[PDB]
Structure 1
């Protein structure tokens, strides 16, 4: 299993040009696709799990996550100098264990194939997964952990929205 996993791969050839490739699976079955350049990013449910008005709402929130994700990469480069091209991998989701009182939720980010940062969702705080210190990772963490709604919203998305989605739709699988 009872889980929703989401994968997003973002290839930046420079701060203003990104190619997205992603997908999500519910209970081990492919259910959603993310594809295309920043200029036209398509997000589709392969199975008709949400009715059109509810999907439309889900999709605008996903597009707004992408806009902010891209904005943060541009901001990091603008303050600390990223080396392009680069590939960012976001792997996130929620799982209901059979022997569990509580969902396991996660959000891990890799850059160029190596561990970069990950979310500690209960405290709604990000940590470095690199043991290597860097101005890039320090600045990225300073932005991610700022006292604004963004990290508390992400916690709600993983702990509430994702979990309720699994509880509602896992039957249809």
Structure 2
């Protein structure tokens, strides 16, 4: 059917973040995420994924969270970011032709940015472009890691999970 993944990152400090999140397969909770950047635990509630695959998945997710944090730190360093800062990322894939994918990020509840795989580009959702919004999109559209490797996650890895379970 689909995957709807959600995380909320509460940054009390650029260098201090509390993560909380989850993922639903179709309409039901399958995964949870919780803890600080130094001790975030990612749990599959429904142990359907092989332990090895799952360990690889957790590694990829932890890599993501560290890179995510690094992006927030860089945005705050280059462009001032007020704290406490809450980042809410909603991403997913939906399946009977080619899969639909999306990724949108809100800041303090206000949709801040989104991904459009058709050109492998990120664009603002917000009608108000400011230094933070422009700078964040740059990193997104300057590196293959944020433009194409993300598509493999959303249009391939995400959908394989959905198709399989």
Shift of 1:112: 0.7
Check the 8 A contact 1:3/1:95 in 2, yes or no.
yes
Alpha-carbon separation, structure 2, partners of 1:129 and 1:140: 12
Deviations 1:6-60 (A, max 9, x none): 0000000110001111000112111000101111000010011111111001110
Secondary structure, counterpart of 1:138 in structure 2: helix
Shift of 1:4: 1.0
Shift of 1:149: 2.9
What is the root-mean-square deviation of aligned Cα atoms in Å? 0.9
Instruction: Using structure 1 for the length normalisation, give the TM-score.
Output: 0.92
Shift of 1:115: 1.2
Per the alignment, residue 3 of structure 2 pairs with 4
Unaligned 5+ residue runs, structure 1?
Answer: none
Check the 8 A contact 2:139/2:146 in 1, yes or no.
no
Deviations 1:149-172 (A, max 9, x none): 332000110000011111111xxx
Alpha-carbon separation, structure 2, partners of 1:142 and 1:28: 34
The alignment of Structure 1 onto Structure 2 pairs a total of residues equal to 165
Alpha-carbon separation, structure 1, partners of 2:67 and 2:51: 24
Check the 8 A contact 1:14/1:85 in 2, yes or no.
yes
Secondary structure, counterpart of 2:148 in structure 1: helix
Query: Higher mean Cα deviation, 35-44 or 117-126?
Result: 117-126
Shift of 1:121: 2.0
Shift of 1:102: 1.5
Check the 8 A contact 2:7/2:21 in 1, yes or no.
yes
Instruction: Using structure 2 for the length normalisation, give the TM-score.
Output: 0.97
Check the 8 A contact 1:21/1:34 in 2, yes or no.
yes
Alpha-carbon separation, structure 1, partners of 2:74 and 2:152: 24
